[PDB]
Symmetry: D2
Subunit: 331 residues, 4 copies
């Protein structure tokens, strides 16, 4: 008998079926930050990685496996073939093309769409019941693209959206007030990044409305220039990109936070990008961030935030602009 | 009054002194993997980062700060100046040079020695009571260098050593047996990397000696070639370097595991590199990995492993080789 | 040589000094629930237990010690003598008397005051710099008592207060809305228990004011009777006492949450009982729960909640009542 | 519209099917310690409690629910009817009768059997695919009883067995050596409690066999009396029972450790009680503790520890004695 059989007596020929499986597609800096954050939060019993760069994919997988002693996720797999992703509960898309020198963002949009046309059908083939969490940028457009290609109902297609923008907002608010972001509440909604909308009416500590304490909050008359807090939500992302080349740690932690609510059926509220047609006069198929209740079925509910006329008009303008771009995309 | 003062009444404006502070020096892939792993294990109330590349250093710090909402380490700081490291309990050195084309390894090591001659006095100046955890390679030589330059007692200078090699051993052992590495026990000692020593006599599951079950274990007569487990401990690191360019995740996790024992005073046993003169037959000032008990005072004790004649001769040969190299380095 | 000395080489025999020590005084159901919750959140490197019942104290300590394999708090000690508590960062008082048949509540409180007159000087003797977290009831009165006897500055004497009441409020609010309590925000302030004050103006999800959506919120005109949420905050505690004899698990979890903010210096906001003279219109030395920022210095700051006339009159009435009782107690 | 519907827009009529559900039956001290330890380790997305004492059951449930803010287990339910347990992955039995004054242990055996004849059929009715983890004493007899009544294959019926005995052994070994139990390895096998067997051949630190260092280890000639370490594994349990009335914290943590391996499919090795017929000459249906590999299918494999003739004869004697009692039990 082999040493294994001398040492170990086998009771069961196991069926080996994954119960809490997560897949990450695209193992760049963002995908691997998502991966490590999920691993260190014990959110999955199996982690699958997919990419098209075969050596990079296998190297990252092996690096994680070598740390298995320090983890409680017993199976880490990888491959270019999507059979490694079968029966995932949650599939996180972090794939994208590399912007070339002198290439505009507009050119990236169709290249990432072309990547999604290859990825998303293979995801559905092997995990027809999964939740899809889209991180690749432009995230609101690509969440729509993923929704359309997958055929999924809208509860099962989730865009990272303004989850990270809101985390940045609360960090910066916390720095102004000397309070941990966990206790500084404030919401950034709409489009991820440049066009996001700070909802000044919801900014509060311990339920005390900042806007009621300081009616000029967020306006141009504001002597304390709190609008600069939202300007820095946008500008600080561009700054990290300039300083280190890309962002990764903050989005990875924010993605693991969303995965936690989904895998643990927590029904916490997150600002994520969701199919918003039927609200705010929006009549087109577009994805924008609103506060959503997240659990094991994806987005089961959303909060209807009371918006001023100006705030509603900004969200409607994002919806119109997104539909304008989406109708020109080739599927 | 300002909004903050309208909202918040201050009881004490006190000079915050750090209680559980860790510094990582060098924010390459290895340093940041250490940083993220430490953050997600709640080991510190303050994390300081140091490097010489100023924009990269600030970008990585800010990226971590943007994730504060998802963390419980309230202060993350950085700078090229070592006053940001003051009063650290643990200082992790992952700094190093990159080999230039056609540069000999000996010259690369001397460049790393020169880097340590700059770093180590500045660390001591601002945290004279810290523990030093050396990760930069060649790790056993540079741990000696750190020990010589710092003036620290040997309990407070620890080299990552074979902690990671042993983790790889147990992952590979677990894969052969179908058992989690947490339950697969085995020790790789001596030098990190190619010259490491697999202690076949300690390989066991549930206290069952594999060597006693299988007396050919690890020999050339072994029909199952268990020696290939140790060969892959060495080769897989080179393979990961070839596939993705470097290793980072597994070393980051293993470093956070050592930090956990030190910061929480666990007195767990780890294979780390320590000044071994007078033990294991070594008569020179060199650092080799043996099982060490780690706690709030660093290495308080070490385990005297019973070695065969061959294993003892291999460690003595490593010590002779390390001593020859160290006297060829300029301090 | 002994087996230990054959196996282990000692580098330093040093006098272990505790770095992150917590003491719980009183090992009833409440004290032990605090103990287990603190152990499972890795908040301390040393846990000390104190009581006057010597056999029970030793049995509980040993029970915890038998679980050390599953914990990461390496030292658990106990004793009737307070030298076991030396150098605690945080001291949690859950000690109290049991009401005797036919004994008036005022006499029961005086017996608890007498207990504090024994405990508090001995705590101060061995940990003069600790933070005091008072859980014993009546908690607001006894927090004042602890503050008066200790001589501590007010930032270092904290009463559990309405931390638990607010947790119950948010659980009940979450149940009504189908949202996790982590995302349901609402504050119960003032006295712990029957006289607590629900701040309807701060009740919100995602920054959306329920009171603004529903102006009758909490009034008698409310067709949905949201006032019953606060009524159940009070009644459910009495119900648990009736059904199982006492409450323990929820208070233990809420105490560990406060300990987490203090031990890790998080500067999160909690509703805890603090010396409120000069704020909120109170002119006597009394402790009432307001939102406080908690960190390594205890209460460094507090939030000034905007109150209605009725809410302010209720807090002033609580202060008048507390002051009348305190002058009827013998110190 | 109601306030809920004004605030929240519903996307899905959810099916509400539990994915990682655990049930605890019997909410005495042991059951509630299991419950809190499982809750604080995030092992379940739904926790169900069952007992026959209806008020106590509802009070404990409510106490846990009031701490929901501090947990990430979103549904806690209870009831005397087993429909609350439907679709559990893992069902933990901690039910038992109260020993009356002057009542022998022998009388308790049939009373606990009678309790199991009511419980186990109802568990199977609502969770036919679950794993059963038996904690009630006498644990090896009652694990057999549970196996027989359930009809389950032997991989899905697990007795707590010697898991806690081994944890106590490693704690006491750690205290002798000054090393954390996590790094002190040693196995207690066979029957839980009085008749358990310390396997001296497996006792080691860092793979260094204590028995080889000290051949008198565990014998009567041992000047250091290491056999007293195993005597205290037994005696310390009786001591805690004498000092505080019962044990609870250590078993609760040990049970949560087993639940972790099962729910996370970790395939760690634990000494748990398993149907051992076919090994050691045992030819009867009995449950004894050996090192077992635990995962999502229960006990999938077990380690065949090399035993001395004396050790094998003690295990065989336990098997004979257990079968002698079991054949007299009424089903
Ligand atoms: N939604 C948010 O808040 C933010 C999203 N992001 C976005 O994440 C995405 C990835 O970011 P990085 O990792 O820095 O970029 P990256 O270029 O380093 O990595 C992208 C990976 O996608 C892989 N890829 C390309 N085609 C593929 C295909 N058919 N199938 C599988 N993999 C494929 C690539 O090989 C690459 O390894 C970017 O679009 C980035 O803008 C970045 C941070 C914040
Ligand atoms: N001991 C072990 O088990 C392992 C150790 N390592 C070693 O970790 C070290 C770092 O690895 P990588 O991050 O991949 O290399 P890297 O070259 O990307 O990172 C080195 C960083 O040190 C910085 N640096 C140079 N001089 C400095 C100085 N005086 N002060 C502060 N920073 C300085 C550099 O700017 C760089 O950011 C390497 O030496 C590597 O061999 C890598 C994996 C396993
Ligand atoms: N503030 C809050 O939100 C809540 C606070 N509590 C309060 O916690 C306190 C303890 O609650 P339980 O454990 O259920 O009561 P308990 O009577 O079972 O525990 C009290 C323990 O204090 C010990 N004791 C008496 N005098 C002592 C002295 N000088 N020194 C040390 N120990 C002494 C007693 O031996 C006893 O073990 C009670 O006063 C209770 O009202 C209970 C739940 C919620
Ligand atoms: N295997 C091990 O390592 C150890 C096991 N134990 C055992 O755990 C068991 C429980 O211990 P404790 O909580 O201290 O005892 P306990 O008597 O306080 O609690 C037992 C609970 O079982 C309930 N019960 C009785 N009949 C029931 C029925 N048909 N259905 C549902 N519930 C029923 C009882 O009402 C009671 O609430 C005991 O047998 C104890 O010996 C204790 C610690 C270590
Ligand atoms: C006609 C056209 C319409 C859209 C086009 C386009 C485009 C494109 C292509 C590559 C990258 C991006 C992009 N990445 N990125 C990042 N953010 C982070 C972070 O860490 O936050 C890291 S990189 C951001 C946010 C910015 C840093 C703060 C954008 C901008 C963007 C723009 C538009 C939508 S949207 N609502 O239209 O989908 C978005 F969601 C985001 C954008 S061309
Ligand atoms: C005269 C001279 C002799 C030696 C010289 C030299 C040298 C040098 C310079 C840069 C990097 C290294 C080096 N990095 N590295 C890594 N490992 C990992 C991981 O993921 O494990 C990632 S990179 C390894 C280990 C190998 C991958 C498995 C080495 C080799 C080494 C050699 C010698 C000592 S030692 N015992 O003398 O300290 C070591 F500890 C390690 C080595 S110049
Ligand atoms: C002249 C006098 C006036 C008052 C006297 C008095 C008194 C006394 C003596 C023992 C126990 C208590 C008490 N315990 N207890 C618990 N709560 C929990 C929980 O799980 O929440 C578990 S038991 C509560 C709260 C209630 C269950 C919901 C009280 C009442 C109380 C009363 C007064 C103050 S106060 N503001 O004056 O400090 C308090 F803080 C609390 C009270 S004698
Ligand atoms: C003819 C007969 C045969 C058996 C009978 C019987 C019986 C009985 C009835 C109630 C309680 C027990 C019992 N509980 N208990 C606890 N332990 C702990 C802990 O914290 O460890 C807490 S209480 C222990 C262990 C001891 C404290 C250290 C026993 C003893 C025992 C005896 C027999 C088997 S077995 N192998 O036959 O199943 C066991 F598993 C355990 C036993 S009458």
């Amino acid at each position: 008998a082999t040493l294994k059989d001398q040492l170990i007596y086998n009771l069961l020929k196991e069926e080996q079926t994954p119960q809490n499986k997560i897949t990450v597609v695209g193992v760049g800096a963002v995908g691997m930050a998502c991966a490590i954050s999920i691993l260190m939060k014990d959110l999955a019993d199996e982690l699958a990685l997919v990419d098209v760069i075969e050596d990079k994919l296998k190297g990252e997988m092996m690096d994680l496996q070598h740390g298995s002693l320090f983890l409680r996720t017993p199976k880490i797999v990888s491959g270019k073939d999507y059979n490694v992703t079968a029966n995932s509960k949650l599939v996180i898309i972090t794939a994208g093309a590399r912007q070339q020198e002198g290439e505009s963002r507009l050119n990236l949009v169709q290249r990432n769409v072309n990547i999604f046309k290859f990825i998303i059908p293979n995801v559905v083939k092997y995990s027809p019941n999964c939740k899809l969490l889209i991180v690749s940028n432009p995230v609101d457009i690509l969440t729509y693209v993923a929704w359309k290609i997958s055929g999924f109902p809208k509860n099962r297609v989730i865009g990272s959206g303004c989850n990270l923008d809101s985390a940045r907002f609360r960090y910066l608010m916390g720095e102004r007030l000397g309070v941990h972001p966990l206790s500084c509440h404030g919401w950034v909604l709409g489009e991820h990044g440049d066009s996001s909308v700070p909802v000044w009416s919801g900014m509060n500590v311990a339920g005390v409305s900042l806007k009621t304490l300081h009616p000029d909050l967020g306006t141009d008359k504001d002597k304390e220039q709190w609008k600069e807090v939202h300007k820095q939500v946008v500008e600080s992302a561009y700054e990290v990109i300039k300083l280190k080349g890309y962002t990764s740690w903050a989005i990875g932690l924010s993605v693991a936070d969303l995965a936690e609510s989904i895998m643990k059926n927590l029904r916490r509220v997150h600002p994520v990008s969701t199919m918003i047609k039927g609200l705010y006069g929006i009549k087109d198929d577009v994805f924008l961030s609103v506060p959503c209740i997240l659990g094991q079925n994806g987005i089961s509910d959303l909060v209807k935030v009371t918006l001023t006329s100006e705030e509603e008009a900004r969200l409607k303008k994002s919806a119109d602009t997104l539909w304008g771009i989406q109708k020109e995309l080739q599927f």
